Each structure stands twice: as C-alpha cells, then as structure tokens.
Amino acid sequence: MNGNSTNNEQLQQELATTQDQVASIIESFVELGVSIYDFPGTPEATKGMITNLQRNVDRLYKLNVRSNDPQSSLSDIPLEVVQYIEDGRNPDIYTREFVEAIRRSNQYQRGKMHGLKQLRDSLADKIVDEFPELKEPVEDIIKRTS
Amino acid sequence: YYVDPETTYTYQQPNPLQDLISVYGLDDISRQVARTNLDGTKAVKLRKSYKNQIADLSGKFSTINFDWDLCSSVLSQFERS
Amino acid sequence: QVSLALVIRNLTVFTMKELAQYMKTNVHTQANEPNSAKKIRFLQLIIFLRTQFLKLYVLVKWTRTIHVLIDLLNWFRTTNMNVNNCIWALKSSLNSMTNAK
C-alpha cells in the first residue's frame, strides 16, 4: 500500500515539474513573440533576443532530455480524442455522451442477464414439471452454468 | 449424453452483475466527472475540446548537426540591418 | 499503448527539423524580401510551435490527472462489442444452419 502511494506521489511530482517547465517555456515563447513584434533594432534589444533564443533552446533541450529518461515515472491518447479536442471548447461533452453510451450498454447487459436468468429458471422448472425423469441432470445443468 | 460431471464452468470474472466501478475502487474519477451531482443538479458547464484548459495562460486564443549559435548570429545580423 | 516519452521525443525532433528548415530557407532566401515579412513568418512559426508545445502541456496535465476512468471505459467498450459480436455470430450461425434444417 505504501509503495503504490510513494509511486503515485513521485509521478505527480514529476508531472508537476514537467507542467511548470512547459508553462515557463510557453511564457518565454510569448515574451519572444512580443519582443519580435515590438523589436526596436537596438544592439541591446538584439542581445536580449539572442539570450531569449538561447534560453528557449536550452529549456527545450532540458525538457526533451528529462522527458526521455527511461527511469522516469512518465514512461493512452487515442486519435479520436485529438480530433475531438480541435473544436475550441472545454472537454466534457465527449466524455458525457460516451459515458452515457457506456451506462446504456451496462444497463442493457444487466437487463439481458436478468431476462436470461428468468428464462432458464422457468425452463428448468417446467422441464422438471413435465419431465421429472430429467430433473436430476437439469439441476446439474445449473451447477454446470452457475 | 453430453452431461459431463467432470466439466465444470466457473463464474466469469469480474461479474457484470456486481458494481464493476467499485470492484477496484474506481469511483473517484467517475464522481469527479459525473454527469450530475448527488442532488441531480449540474456541476459544471460541459463542452467539447481542450481550449478552456489554456484560458488561464496569457494570450488570445480566438481561433483553435544543428548550430544554434550560427542561426542566432544570422538572425541578429538580419535584424540589425 | 504509446509511450509519452516517445511522443515527446518525436515532437521535439519535428520542432528541431522545422526550425532548421526555416533557418535554411531564410539563409538561401534573396535579400530583396523585406525583413518585416521574414519576421512575421518567424513569429507565425514560433506561434505554431508554442501551440504544439501547449498541446503537449495539455496532454501532460491530463496524464497528471490520470487511467482509472480510461480502464473502466475500455473494459466496458470491450464487453459491449463482444456482446455485439456474439449476437452477430448467433445470427450468422442460424443463417448458415437454416440450410441444414
């Protein structure tokens, strides 16, 4: 029990660190774009642009190196999820409808199981009734099924 | 004829009759993204895509071998011109 | 199952290749083109790369939230089309065996 909790905590910490690093990368890219749009052409601005580019490259390299660690806890995303997330929204209706379909399938399964159970119970009862000589195997049939 | 006492069929595991969500203690995430709360009221507004997961970040998302030093120097020379 | 590390490595390799191609194209592009157009193209490329990295960020956040719901979801789907396949197999068996009737 303790090992699973420790592994979960380590995975959460690693994912939080990755999230923070990627957020910093995104902020640096936003700053880079802002500087490019409002570039004055001064040598100091050029040096700042070079430093920002170097920092972005170093951050990307560090993220690639850390995320590729075989010992990292990071090591499924279906293509349908990628297709659904391309619609500019908050990702809930896909899960809602597909879980609704899942629940409908489960309710169908339970209802058909109950129906089949009553079917074979009634059939066993009547086979015992009109055919007492076959009563003994029928119960064994239940033992063979249940 | 086919009644073989040696042939015994076991119950399918897990049993679909039982609550399969709670078999492995898998109710936390289901409750987190449940359609409705315990009182039946809507919890959160529902939508389709990942856009609202990036709204907190700055920006306007209206529509949704290699020498780095040499490239940086080339960009610097181009910008200074 | 696709490893997240492999996806991240592939995305980084694609980003590096795109950046190298853009730098090369700027290198052999004639100087007659105004620097404003090149700056706009570089900004657009940076925005696209940032969007890809933000998609990776969203995937990382989802994995941080992560599989329990995914595992239940996949198991229930497997049960569903297994039942459907059993029904179709029953129908096919009756269609085939009607000849022997």
UniProtKB/Swiss-Prot annotation, chain A:
- What job does the chain carry out? Component of the Mediator complex, a coactivator involved in the regulated transcription of nearly all RNA polymerase II-dependent genes. Mediator functions as a bridge to convey information from gene-specific regulatory proteins to the basal RNA polymerase II transcription machinery. The Mediator complex, having a compact conformation in its free form, is recruited to promoters by direct interactions with regulatory proteins and serves for the assembly of a functional preinitiation complex with RNA polymerase II and the general transcription factors.
Q: Does the keyword Acetylation apply?
A: no
Superkingdom, according to UniProt? Eukaryota
Question: Which positions are tagged coiled coil?
Answer: none
Q: What is this protein called?
A: Mediator of RNA polymerase II transcription subunit 10
Give the record's keywords alphabetically. Activator, Nucleus, Transcription, Transcription regulation
Where it mainly occurs, coarsely classed, is nucleus
A Gene Ontology biological process in which this protein takes part is: negative regulation of transcription by RNA polymerase II
Partners and quaternary state?
Component of the Mediator complex, which is composed of at least 21 subunits that form three structurally distinct submodules. The Mediator head module contains MED6, MED8, MED11, SRB4/MED17, SRB5/MED18, ROX3/MED19, SRB2/MED20 and SRB6/MED22, the middle module contains MED1, MED4, NUT1/MED5, MED7, CSE2/MED9, NUT2/MED10, SRB7/MED21 and SOH1/MED31, and the tail module contains MED2, PGD1/MED3, RGR1/MED14, GAL11/MED15 and SIN4/MED16. The head and the middle modules interact directly with RNA polymerase II, whereas the elongated tail module interacts with gene-specific regulatory proteins.
What more does the entry say? Present with 1472 molecules/cell in log phase SD medium.
- GO molecular function list: transcription coregulator activity
Q: Which family does it belong to?
A: Belongs to the Mediator complex subunit 10 family.
Q: Provide the protein's localization.
A: Nucleus
GO cellular component terms given for this protein: core mediator complex; mediator complex; nucleus
Which gene holds the coding sequence for this protein?
NUT2
UniProtKB/Swiss-Prot annotation, chain B:
Subcellular locations according to the entry: Nucleus
- Superkingdom, according to UniProt? Eukaryota
The UniProt subunit note reads as follows:
Component of the Mediator complex, which is composed of at least 21 subunits that form three structurally distinct submodules. The Mediator head module contains MED6, MED8, MED11, SRB4/MED17, SRB5/MED18, ROX3/MED19, SRB2/MED20 and SRB6/MED22, the middle module contains MED1, MED4, NUT1/MED5, MED7, CSE2/MED9, NUT2/MED10, SRB7/MED21 and SOH1/MED31, and the tail module contains MED2, PGD1/MED3, RGR1/MED14, GAL11/MED15 and SIN4/MED16. The head and the middle modules interact directly with RNA polymerase II, whereas the elongated tail module interacts with gene-specific regulatory proteins.
**What is noted besides the main data?**
Present with 6116 molecules/cell in log phase SD medium.
Q: Which purpose does this protein serve, as stated in its record?
A: Component of the Mediator complex, a coactivator involved in the regulated transcription of nearly all RNA polymerase II-dependent genes. Mediator functions as a bridge to convey information from gene-specific regulatory proteins to the basal RNA polymerase II transcription machinery. The Mediator complex, having a compact conformation in its free form, is recruited to promoters by direct interactions with regulatory proteins and serves for the assembly of a functional preinitiation complex with RNA polymerase II and the general transcription factors.
Per the record, the similarity remark reads: Belongs to the Mediator complex subunit 19 family.
Protein name as catalogued: Mediator of RNA polymerase II transcription subunit 19
**Organism of derivation:** Saccharomyces cerevisiae (strain ATCC 204508 / S288c)
From Swiss-Prot, chain C:
Protein name per Swiss-Prot or TrEMBL:
Mediator of RNA polymerase II transcription subunit 14
**Protein family membership:** Belongs to the Mediator complex subunit 14 family.
A further note on this protein reads: Present with 319 molecules/cell in log phase SD medium.
Biological role stated in the UniProt entry: Component of the Mediator complex, a coactivator involved in the regulated transcription of nearly all RNA polymerase II-dependent genes. Mediator functions as a bridge to convey information from gene-specific regulatory proteins to the basal RNA polymerase II transcription machinery. The Mediator complex, having a compact conformation in its free form, is recruited to promoters by direct interactions with regulatory proteins and serves for the assembly of a functional preinitiation complex with RNA polymerase II and the general transcription factors.
Which species does this protein come from? Saccharomyces cerevisiae (strain ATCC 204508 / S288c)
Q: Which stretch of the intact protein is present?
A: 89 to 194 of 1082
Cell location: Nucleus
Q: Subunit arrangement?
A: Component of the Mediator complex, which is composed of at least 21 subunits that form three structurally distinct submodules. The Mediator head module contains MED6, MED8, MED11, SRB4/MED17, SRB5/MED18, ROX3/MED19, SRB2/MED20 and SRB6/MED22, the middle module contains MED1, MED4, NUT1/MED5, MED7, CSE2/MED9, NUT2/MED10, SRB7/MED21 and SOH1/MED31, and the tail module contains MED2, PGD1/MED3, RGR1/MED14, GAL11/MED15 and SIN4/MED16. The head and the middle modules interact directly with RNA polymerase II, whereas the elongated tail module interacts with gene-specific regulatory proteins.
